[PDB]
Amino acid sequence: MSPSDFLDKLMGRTSGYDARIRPNFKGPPVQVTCNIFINSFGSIAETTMDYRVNIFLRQKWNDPRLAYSEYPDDSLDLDPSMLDSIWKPDLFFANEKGANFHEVTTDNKLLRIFKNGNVLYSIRLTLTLSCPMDLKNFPMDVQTCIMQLESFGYTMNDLIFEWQDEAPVQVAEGLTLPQFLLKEEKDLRYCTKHYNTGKFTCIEVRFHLERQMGYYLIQMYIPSLLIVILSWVSFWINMDAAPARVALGITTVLTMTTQSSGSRASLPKVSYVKAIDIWMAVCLLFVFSALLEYAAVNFVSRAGTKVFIDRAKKIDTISRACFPLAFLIFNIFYWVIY
Amino acid sequence: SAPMSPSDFLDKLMGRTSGYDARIRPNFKGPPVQVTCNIFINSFGSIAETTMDYRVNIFLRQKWNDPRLAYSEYPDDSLDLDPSMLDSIWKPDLFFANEKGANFHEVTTDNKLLRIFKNGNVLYSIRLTLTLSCPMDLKNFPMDVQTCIMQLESFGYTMNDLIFEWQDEAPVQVAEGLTLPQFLLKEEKDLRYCTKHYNTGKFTCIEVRFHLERQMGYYLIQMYIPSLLIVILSWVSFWINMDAAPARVALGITTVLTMTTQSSGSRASLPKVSYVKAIDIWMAVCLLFVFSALLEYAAVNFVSRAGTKVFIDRAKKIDTISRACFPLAFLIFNIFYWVIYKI
Amino acid sequence: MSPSDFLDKLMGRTSGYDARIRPNFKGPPVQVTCNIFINSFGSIAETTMDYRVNIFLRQKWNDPRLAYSEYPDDSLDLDPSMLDSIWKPDLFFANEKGANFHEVTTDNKLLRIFKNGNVLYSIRLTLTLSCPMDLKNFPMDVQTCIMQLESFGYTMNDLIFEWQDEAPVQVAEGLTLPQFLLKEEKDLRYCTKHYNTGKFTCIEVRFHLERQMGYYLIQMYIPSLLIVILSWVSFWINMDAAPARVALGITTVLTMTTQSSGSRASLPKVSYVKAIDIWMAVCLLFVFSALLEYAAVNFVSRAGTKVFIDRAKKIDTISRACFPLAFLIFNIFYWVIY
Amino acid sequence: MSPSDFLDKLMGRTSGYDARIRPNFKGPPVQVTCNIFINSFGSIAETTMDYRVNIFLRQKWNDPRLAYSEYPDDSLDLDPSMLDSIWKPDLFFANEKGANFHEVTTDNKLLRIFKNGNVLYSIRLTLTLSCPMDLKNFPMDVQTCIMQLESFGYTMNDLIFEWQDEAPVQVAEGLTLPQFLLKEEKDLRYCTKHYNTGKFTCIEVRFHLERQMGYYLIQMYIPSLLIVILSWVSFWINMDAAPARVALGITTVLTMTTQSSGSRASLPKVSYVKAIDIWMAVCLLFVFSALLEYAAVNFVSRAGTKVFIDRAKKIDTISRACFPLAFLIFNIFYWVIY
Amino acid sequence: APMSPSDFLDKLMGRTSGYDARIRPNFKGPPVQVTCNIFINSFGSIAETTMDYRVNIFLRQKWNDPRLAYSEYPDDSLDLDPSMLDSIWKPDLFFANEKGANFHEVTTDNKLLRIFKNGNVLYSIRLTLTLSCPMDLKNFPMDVQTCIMQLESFGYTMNDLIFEWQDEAPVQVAEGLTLPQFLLKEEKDLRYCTKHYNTGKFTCIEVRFHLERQMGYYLIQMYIPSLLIVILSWVSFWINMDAAPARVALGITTVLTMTTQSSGSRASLPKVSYVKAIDIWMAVCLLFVFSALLEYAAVNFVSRAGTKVFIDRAKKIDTISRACFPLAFLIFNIFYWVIYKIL
Ligand SMILES: C[C@H]1[C@H]2C(=O)N(C)c3ccncc3[C@H]2CN1S(=O)(=O)c1ccc2c(c1)OCO2
Ligand SMILES: C[C@H]1[C@H]2C(=O)N(C)c3ccncc3[C@H]2CN1S(=O)(=O)c1ccc2c(c1)OCO2
Ligand SMILES: C[C@H]1[C@H]2C(=O)N(C)c3ccncc3[C@H]2CN1S(=O)(=O)c1ccc2c(c1)OCO2
Ligand SMILES: C[C@H]1[C@H]2C(=O)N(C)c3ccncc3[C@H]2CN1S(=O)(=O)c1ccc2c(c1)OCO2
Ligand SMILES: C[C@H]1[C@H]2C(=O)N(C)c3ccncc3[C@H]2CN1S(=O)(=O)c1ccc2c(c1)OCO2
Ligand SMILES: [Cl-]
C-alpha cells in the first residue's frame, strides 16, 4: 500500500479520524509519558528571577485509531506536517514567562507511530522559566529551579501526565554553567493543580544549582579584605601625622561603602540581609573603628605631656594586635557558619 | 441506544449543518449579553517605576449564555471541547484598556479552554501575559503604597449589546505562595466599574485594583544606613585638633561630596519626576548636616586666627557645643522624619 | 431578514461587492474624516528622539454600496471580521518608527454602518513616532511633537483626509506625563506630500510639551550650586593651610567636571550648546577661579613679610565679597534670560 | 468593462497569468529600475557598527502580459492585494541585519500599471544595515555607509537591477542627524556578486557621513584641557607644600586615566590607536610630567642649602614657561594634522 | 511547441503529478545523501557574557530526487520560483547549538530553488543565527576561542537521511569580512557530531571557527593604565620621608585605583570562578602598589626617634626601594609576557 493511501486511510480524508476527540474518549484518561533532553541551560538571572533552557520535549501515549497492520515495520517515522491531523496533549509550562518553537530550517518536530498505535512526539523548545530565589546565603547559596508540565484544558479524568520510568531527564554531555554547578540529582514531583475550573495534571522537575565561590573571592571578598588591611597601616603611622591617618580612615570608610553597594548591584532589591551584607557591614565597622581609634589617639594626646602621649601610644600598640586578632576571629565564625 | 458521534454533534451544533453564525451575538434582538469574569493570577512582577507599569500572567475566565449551544443529546452536564472550536462560536471582545503589551500563549498548543453546558452556558478560559500601565505617586517613596489597576473593557459592543460583571464568588484568585521581592501584595482587592463614554458610544468596563506596599529593608541597607554613616563620619571632625586643618577639611570635603553622589544615586532607578520625595528630604537634610560640619570648622579656623587665649577658647567652645548639638539635632530630625512617614 | 442573508446580500457572496474598488471610483475623491482618542502618551525619549502613544483611530467615510433599507435602525454594529470584506482607506503614519495592532483578546476594531452608507471604523493602535527635538534651552525647553496621517497608495484625486470639525483629538481624563506638561491646545494642519509617485493627502496634529523644571533643580542646579558655595569656604581658611585650600580647589573643580558630563548623560550627543551647558561651564569657571585665587595668595605671600602677607590677606577679603556677588549677578542674568 | 472583470481577465481566474514566470522568460533578462526615498535615517551605532533607515523602495519594470487597451487611462492605480497575483523581482538588501514591512493601518504598498505593461511598485521598509567603520581619526572621522540591493534567486541572465537615471535617491526635506552631516553627494555603483551558485545583479548606494565636532569639544577635549591647566598651578605653589603639590599631581593623573577610558566607553573595542587616544595619551603624559617635576623639586632641595634651593626654584620657573609652551606646540601639530 | 511552464510544474510536482512531499526520495532504499555548504555573509556580536555569536549565512543543500528528473527541456537546470519549495520534499536541517534563528522575507523570501535534468536539487536559504560558543577565558585577553556550528537532522535517523560537507570549498567567507576584536583564521575544521539520543541516531556535521583575540585594545584600556599607576606609586620613594601625608596619599590612591582597575577588567565578562591572565596581572600590580605603601609605613616607623642611626636606616630602605621595585617589576613582566606570548 502506497504511503499516500495509507496516510489517507489512517488520519486523512477517508479515515474518519477526528483530532478533536481524545483516544478512548468514553474510557479512562489518556496516560501520557514525558521525558526531556536538556540541550542548553543558562541565562540564570537573579534580577528578573528566572532562567532559560533549550529542550527536546518528548511525549508518549497510545491512540488505538493509529494502530496499523499494513506494514511489518515496528514503527513509522512520519512527516511532521501530519501532527496537525492527529490528537495530541495540550501540555504547557506553568511557570513559563517566555516560550517559542523552532522553525529553522523546518519545524523542529518529530512524529513516530507504532504498530499498536503508540505515538512518540518530540519537539524542540526554548523556555524562560521563573525561578524564585532565596538569597539569604548569597553568594554561598544553592537555588532550586523548577519546571512544571501541566494540561491547560483537560481535567484528570480525561488526561494524566507522568514522568517516564527510565531516565526522564537527560542532560547534554559536557554542559556547564559559568556561575553554577548543576547537580546530577533532579527531584521529580507532582504539582497537581486545583483551580475553580477543575483539577489538572501537573508534573514537576527540580534542578539544584550550587553557586560557585571563586568569582566572589576575586571580585568582592579579597578586595574588601585588602581595604581592611589598608586601614591597619594607620596604627604604624606617627600620631603627629593627623592628615595622613585621617586620610587613611576616610578613604577606607568611603571605599567600603561603595564596595558595599557594589556587592548588591547585580541583585534584585530584596529587603532581607544576605551573607555578603553581613561581611560588608562588619568590614565597614572594622574600618570605621580604625578611624575612631585615631580620633581617640589624637584627642587623648592634645596636651603634649608625657603621661598623655604614653596613653595615646598604648592605644596604638594594643590596636596593632587587637584589630587583626578580632578580624581573624570574625573570619573563623563567618566561614565556619556558612 | 447509540449515542450521537461527537463529529456529527459538533457539525449540528456549530458546524456546517448548524446554521450557527458566530457574527451574531446571543439574543441579538433581546437584552445585552451578561458576561461574568474572573481571573487567576499565575504571576505578578516586573513592577517598574521608570516605565511606570507592571506585568501579570493570568488565566482570564469568561462566562455567558448562548441558547444556540444548549444540548440534549448527552446526559453530561457539561462538555469539554477542543479549543479549535472557539473560532466557530461567538465570544465577547474583551480587551484590557490600560494594556501596553499583551500576548497569548501557544506552546505547546493554544493555552485555551472551552466548556459548554446543557443549558447553553459557556466557560472560556485563556492564558495571557499583560504589561499594564500603573501611574505611580512617589511623594512618600520609598515608604509608598501604590495602586495598580486592570481594566477589562468591550471594544466594539455598547452597553445595550454587551455587559461585563465580576463573578460573585472569588472573582480574583492568586496562586499560592506568590511573592514579590520589593512589595507586599495586599489580600484585599477593590472591584469597581470604569464605564467608558467615548464619541462612539458607551462601553462596559470593569476594574480590579491591587494594593502594593513597598518593603523598607532594601532602602535601609542601600540608602538610609550608608547615609547615616557619612553623617556620623562628619562628626569625628569635632574631636580632631583644630590645628589639623587639612584633616578636618578633608573630612568636610569627602562627606559633602559623598553625600551629593549618595543623593543622585537615590533617584537613579526612578522616573524623572519634578516633585520632592521622602528620600529627597532625607538626603537633603543629611547633606545640610554634613555641610554644616564643614562650615563649623571654617568658623573654628577663622575665629582662632589670632592665636590668643580668648579666641582659642571661643573656637574650642564652638567644638564642644558641636559635639553635643549635631548628634542631638540629628536625633530630633530622625524622630520627626520617621514619625511623620511611618506612623 | 436574517443578518446572515443581509450580510451576504450587502458585502458577501451574492452582493457583487468588490473591496478593491473605492466608493464612487469614477467620481470625486473619497472624503475621509478622522479623529483620534489618546488613551496613553509617554516614553518621550531624547536619545532616540521619539515618543509613544496608544490611540483609537476613527475614520469616517461614505460608501453608497453599503446603504440599506432592510432595517429601521439608523446604524448597525457589525462583527469586525467583516472589515476584510469592505473597502477602506490605506491610512499610514508617515513619521512612525514602530506600530502595532492589538489582538487580545480579539481584534481591537470596531465597524459601524449607517442607513445612508456612511461607515465608522475605529481601531486601536500603539505608535512610536519620531519627534526631532531642539535642545538649545534644555532643560527649560518646549518641544513640538507631530503625528502625520497619510495615504500610501491613493493620490488626491482618489482619496482625501480631513480632521473632523468637532473635537478631532480627545485625550483621556487625568492623563499626565512625569517630565512634561501636555498643553491643551493642539495645532491641526495639512502636510500634503509630493513624491515622484504623485501627490498624497496628509493631515497632521501637533502637540506641545513643556518640560517640568523641578527634577533639574534637585538633580543638577542645586547640587552644582552647593559645589560653588563649597569652593568659597576656602576664602575663610588660613592661608598657611595650603593642603586644605588646595584640596578644596581640586575636589570642587573635579566634581564640577563630572557634574558637567553627568548633565548630558541622558541626552543625544548634539554638537550645540544647551542652557544646562552654559550653567555648568560658568559654575566650573567660578570654582576654578577660586583655586587660582589661592595660587595667587600662596604666591604673593612667599616672603613671610608684613607687606606681602597683607597683600595676600586683601586678596582673600575681597574674594569673600566678590565671588558670591559675581555669582549672584550671573544668576540674575541666567534665570531672567531663559 | 467593469474593474472586476478586467482584473479577472488580466491577472485573475480567466487570465492564464502565472506569477511564477518572469516577463519575457525565454528572452533577455528583466530590466528593473530602482529608486529610493529616504524618509528617515538614524540610529548610527559605532558599537554594533550599523545604521537604520526608513525608505520607500520603488521598482519599475515591463511585463507585456499586463498591457491593456480597455481603458484610455495612461495608468491604473490598483489595490495592493493584487501584488500577490503578479510577478515581481526578489530584491533583498545584502548588508541588512534587520528588515520589516509596514502593515498599519494596511499594507504600506503601492501598485500602478501602465498601458504598455510597465509596472511601478513601491513599498515602505525599515532596514538596519551594517556599516563597518574606520575609527582611526575619531572623532574627526568621516564614514561611508552603503546599501546594497541584490537579487537572491535570479542570475544576471534572468534579472538585472539598475538605478534610475533621474534622481535615484531622494531624501526627505529637513532631515538631519544629531551627530553627523549627511553629504548631498551619494555614490552609485555596481556590486555584482559571484557565488558558487552563480552571478547575481547588485547595485549599491554610498552615503557619506561627517561627524560633528562640537559634542567632543564639550565632553572630552575641553574638560581634558582643564585638567592639564590644573596640573600647572602646582608650579606656582610653594615647594615646601609637599602634600598640596603631590595632591595636584595624583588627582590630575587619576582623573586623566578615567577621562581616557571614558573617551572610548561608547565605542567598539578596536585594537588600533584613534585620534582621541593620541590626545588623551599626550594629556596624560603632560600631567604625569608635572608630578615628576615636583618629585625632582622635592628631591634636589632635600639639603636645605641656598645652592640646592636655588636649583629647585629654577626647575619651577622654567616649568612655568615650558609646560604651557610645549602644550601649545603639541596643540598646533595635533589640530593641523587632523 | 515546448510545454508551458504552468503545465510542466503541474505534471512534475503539482495537481496531476502524484508527488507527495511527505515521502523522501528513495524511501524504501538507502538514506538520502545531502551535501551542504555555507556562505558567511556576516559574522559578529561575539559576546563573552551570553557566551554566543551571530552569523548571517546562505545555507546551501544539495540532494537527488528522482521524481524531479525531467526531459521536457534541453536545459541542464531550471531556476524555479521559491513558492514551489512548499510542494517538494526537503531535508529538516536544524542548528543544534542555535539560540536564535530567523528567515529573511524582505522584499520576498530569501530562498533559491534550482532543479537539474537528473533530478538533483539545489536549495539555498538566507539565515541569521545566534549560536552558542562556550568560551575558555583562562588566558584572557590573550585567548583564542573555538566557535562551532552544528547542522543536524531533527526527525530523520541515519538510515533515512545523511548530511555531508561538500568536497570543494564547503565554507566560503565574504571578501573583506573583518571583526573588531578578533581575527577569524582561514583554516576551519570540519567534523562529524553524530548524535545518539533515546529517540535514535541522527546525522550531524560541524564546522569550527578559530578566533584569535586582538591585543591592542587591552594594552590601551587595561595594561598601560595599570602600568602607570604602578610607576606613580614609585615617585613616593623620591619624596621626603618627612612628608607623611604626601607619601600616604600616594599609597592610598594607587591602591584604591588599582582595586577599581581590577574590577573594571572583569566588567564585560561572565562571572567565571577561575583565575584569568588579566587577573594575575591586576593582582600583582595591586601587590606592588600595596608594597610601596607598606614600604613607607616601615620608613615612617623606623625613623620615629629622630636620631642619625635610625634616620639613616630609613633612608637606606628608600634608596634600595628606588632600585628594587622597578627591577622586580621588570622581572615579573619578563615572566608574564614570555609565559602567555609563548605557552
Ligand atoms: C469528544 C470530546 C468532547 C466533544 O467534543 N464532545 C461533543 C463530547 C461529546 C460527548 N462526551 C464528551 C465530549 C467532549 C469530551 N471529548 S474528549 O475527552 O475527547 C476531549 C477533547 C478535547 C478536549 C477535552 C476533552 O478537554 C480539553 O479539550
Ligand atoms: C446581527 C448583528 C449585526 C448585523 O450584522 N446585522 C445585520 C444587524 C441587523 C439588525 N440589527 C442589528 C444588527 C447588528 C447587531 N447584531 S449583534 O448585536 O449580534 C452584534 C454583532 C457584532 C458586534 C456588535 C453587535 O457590536 C459590534 O460587534
Ligand atoms: C477600480 C480601481 C482601479 C482598477 O483596478 N481598475 C481596473 C481601474 C479601471 C478603470 N479606471 C481606474 C481603475 C483603478 C482605480 N480604481 S480606484 O479608484 O477604486 C482605486 C482602487 C485601489 C487603489 C487606488 C485606486 O489607488 C490605491 O489603490
Ligand atoms: C518559467 C520559469 C521557470 C520554470 O518554472 N520552468 C518550469 C521553466 C521551464 C523552462 N525554462 C525555464 C524555466 C524556469 C525559468 N523561468 S523564469 O525565468 O520565469 C524564473 C522564474 C522564477 C525564478 C527564476 C526564473 O529564477 C529565480 O526564480
Ligand atoms: C513514507 C514515509 C513515512 C510514511 O508516511 N509511511 C506511511 C511509511 C510507510 C512505510 N514505511 C515508512 C513510512 C514512513 C517513512 N517514509 S520516509 O522515509 O519517506 C520519511 C518521511 C518523513 C519523515 C521521515 C521518513 O522521518 C522523519 O520524517
Ligand atoms: Cl585628598
Ligand SMILES: [Zn+2]
Ligand atoms: Zn534533590
Ligand SMILES: [Zn+2]
Ligand atoms: Zn482596597
Ligand SMILES: [Zn+2]
Ligand atoms: Zn499650539
Ligand SMILES: [Zn+2]
Ligand atoms: Zn562620494
Ligand SMILES: [Zn+2]
Ligand atoms: Zn583548526
